[PDB]
Symmetry: D3
Subunit: 233 residues, 6 copies
């Protein structure tokens, strides 16, 4: 049965990357929660997609340039609705809060891979966690510090299912719906012994079904509720 | 339920690292089969333990100095029982193709070329059902560089602590002696670490076998598949 | 005398990267066959240049997304000429075996598993007569830690300086444009560095071929073995 | 002015590797404190020398097979004296925080997770006033790839030459025996390489201490802070 | 106290990357002399910024394609009282500066092994730090000389806590705008980093700002002003 | 034909690793000169085998602990014979300078800075005419990381199989013993692996010399060039 990976939490009904967005996703049936990591000017791990506070908080400028004390005081939920001054979660709490409740797909944006390794190791969440990053710097870093961690590569970058493990040292391959459909793509990913996650952040119930129907291990989506119902069938 | 890992195949009643010994262990309920691998003078991958041929074949000297053509000649069963005269020193090549689909494989690199092992396993598509280890640092470094994604294991005697099996030795699997399986905190520390757990037994004591089947262990490295299957 | 490196076979008279373009190249006096490698969806090493099958086959899309079983189906000659209707997309497998004992091979990795390439060559015993290159930094580093000892080359365009081919790029062979060949100190620096020199041309100006054949150059990476071979035979006589 | 490095603390008057030993050393004049890092079965960084609890605690067996829960239960002081019956096995956690701002710290990894150490140190902002070493190659290489910016030392016995401390061992500090210190070439060669100089001793000969203080050395890896402390003052 | 790093000498008063621009700046109170290094076709280190000879020489083309011999010929003073000024070999330039100042070496494109050997030989490790916009040059030197001092700009590291943890540098460089921002210097100090500020701006009003700030180095293009 | 590798120089007629012992070797027709490098306390690369200055000089103590200034002033010939009174321990600097153009150089690192070696050989343009080795894994890993290009040898004793001389020890040259040279499959395997072959002897049983010279061997690591040389003529 395909597991649900919630892309930045219950994105459509709660401020992305918030305990609320996260808690909501767990309610709608998400099996995993995806988050994005960044580091404050003073070395603290936070959950936030953008490089700057602007788009999703009461603050502005590079998160890398701000100290945590200030960051910990920003509003990260009012921009969505007044019903939400949610905090820019610290990977510290955000993870401890998720531990035991779900798996976490951690995507490094820019931070210290060592701190991530040390933390995940401290919490004992190695098995139930997997990594990725568009930053080559981050991948190599995490690849050198934590080879044993589960990581994933996109077919888009790997060029071939056979190279996801061989070249990108990953055990999970992310493919689009178009790639999911191509006959050999799944058989190949399977020959390579990869878990398979398909990315789709839309509303087409049909697409959700077709995925819940295919030989796929995960779905990285922006609407867990929909896929959860389709999985109901 | 604990999975069975046949150490050198059912060697108590068959020649170790032989198709016979392996098919035997397989028939006695083995879930995985463990191999020993070395490379010939001319780069061929063989399933043999000792560095030399003397002990388990009718040949002599270092395996690294004999051509594959001469090796495929030797008898790898005679020394054991007369009932084993044909017994060849299997080629990792053919040995894995055979097991491919009948069981899992635990490949211990004695001394060879990691690249050829990774090329081989990736071609047979046996990445998910195999794991590695070596007492040679050189071999582990090579394999670690060539195939980080590969599942591997470290023993507790080397890692010093379960918290270091993955963190320091990049292992996903931890192997422990039955004694260590007894220490209350060891199995728990390993689970905290998220490692798979395997115990090396291969004894006669059917009680220990039942004790391990009882504990929260994932695999049991064995010399007597027969016994454990019953339990 | 200068050695000839056939750029993806005698491509001007045969479908590039094809057993046909290669045999032609051999018959025409080439000492090395240059070939491009990519990997199928299921990990089979193939000889083909483009990322997609569209141009040199009757198939379409990325090769990385198609299973070798269907790939072996395609026709890699038909597009060049009716004479080549059933040319297959060579499996590095067969190709290298067919070339072993017949020529040297210059293997350019486009995108594939370095481990498989190194493993295959070590098995055929072809490490002395093959050299590598790749435009993909990822492929280069992969092969650099997997096969530090293989023979490799770097372009001056990338190395910036002959002295950096081996120093920074770990290569023992430098590739140069005809223009850089003419620069007085380039061939000399490369010589001080202990590098083998290769000039990439592949045009059809007889003058250039004769010039190159006349310079202090070890190899000529070209598109027309027929031309350079003539010029070279001419040199051979004088050599007598 | 030669700075003093207290090897496992004032181990000559207090149970080694305990806060008691650390504060005592601080008082005898210590500039730096030396620890040894091990790791519990569940990944908690502890300050204890031996691979086994036996010799310096009321616990027995490998430190790596025991959960922090039980370790935090041991008596790392009683064996030394009744005055210290209380003593606990210091978690690198708190031990470091307690020293931060009060003294420099020489961290010697026995066997543990380099990553856990590098993260802890960065989080505590103690990068600068701290330096590392280890006799485990596995440990040094682990730390070398994870934290190459850290300050670290190499013993001459291993580096063979002073010009190889940095070039081959990537170290910034060279440890020298009082003997090797005497050779006029050793010290000058070290300085040429831009190295810091530390002399390991831990002996009680006021004779030696005087000489070391005499020499052109930066640190002295001591076992008797009081002795050299007195000698330094006089100068 | 804040030290002065001369961005390839007093490039404003004398031909950049020259013994002249080095002496002048050194005389004006400069503490360090920043220099740009490239390698000739026959492998000789040379101080010159651009990849091509043109801009600051009577010779043309890439430096990488010219033999040291012919390069030694060129005059890198003309284009600026100076005329016979030569393109300095890192050999002489480094020996010439030893004992008189620190040296900030910025690798443009060359062999890190040659640089490390040279600096190790000359006993100049402690008084020198590195950088390079080239990932290749940085990884090369990082693997060859982990111990050398190096800097990463905040522009690239994104966070002060990442200058050492990710780019393995002990020196962080920043702009004045960044210098002005509160918690930046603070975070930089927590990471135990040395702080350098780039500013080739004559606004003597900012030179005053920097001076009063908690900086360690000032990589200026006009030493004189800051010296005042 | 077989190239001659003068192991430490003409051993029975001139103090090992000396200018005198090298020039003498060249006369007996040596093609290559094997050296042993060690670094002086102050960073100078010298040519000397032992870790200490005892056995081969009038000085004493580990070479690494003595400054170059001093070492330069020592006597490396008197120990051998009054004839070589004054022989100096050769800096790899001038020793390579002196050999460039007249011989191949087998540079065996004992314990020094691989970068210093690397830079030197690069500057003197002697990359093609030299190959390397070291029993020290520490030295081998460093040279390997700094100069993968350099040609290097590995003994079959260590590689366990000619097929691993390249694949694992990244070397193109395999040094074997006469004993192994006699074993059938060996030399052939080495050829299948495209390896250059070198045999170590240093003995004086001139029968063997010819056995080696009549074998498919490219190099001979000798103690007596004079002998093998004449067997060559």
């Amino acid at each position: 049965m395909t597991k649900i990976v919630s892309h930045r939490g219950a994105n459509r009904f709660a401020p992305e990357n918030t305990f609320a967005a996260a808690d909501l996703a767990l309610q709608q049936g998400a099996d995993y929660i995806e988050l994005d990591v960044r580091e404050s000017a003073d070395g603290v791990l936070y959950v936030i997609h953008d490089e700057t506070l602007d788009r999703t908080t009461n603050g502005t400028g590079p998160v890398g340039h701000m100290l945590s004390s200030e960051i910990d005081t920003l509003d990260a939920g009012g921009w969505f609705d007044d019903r939400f001054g949610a905090i820019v979660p610290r990977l510290d709490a955000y993870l401890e809060h998720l531990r035991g409740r779900a798996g976490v797909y951690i995507e490094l944006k820019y931070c210290d891979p060592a701190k991530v390794a040390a933390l995940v190791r401290h919490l004992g969440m190695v098995r139930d966690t997997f990594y990725f990053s568009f930053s080559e710097e981050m991948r190599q870093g995490l690849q050198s510090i934590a080879p044993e961690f589960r990581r994933m590569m996109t077919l888009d970058i790997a060029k071939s299912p056979s190279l996801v493990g061989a070249v990108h040292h990953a055990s999970i391959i992310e493919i689009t719906p178009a790639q999911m459909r191509r006959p050999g793509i799944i058989e190949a990913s399977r020959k390579a012994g990869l878990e398979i996650m398909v990315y789709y952040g839309g509303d087409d119930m049909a697409v959700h079904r077709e995925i819940a129907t295919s030989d796929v291990d995960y779905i990285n989506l922006d609407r867990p509720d929909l896929f959860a119902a389709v999985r109901s069938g």
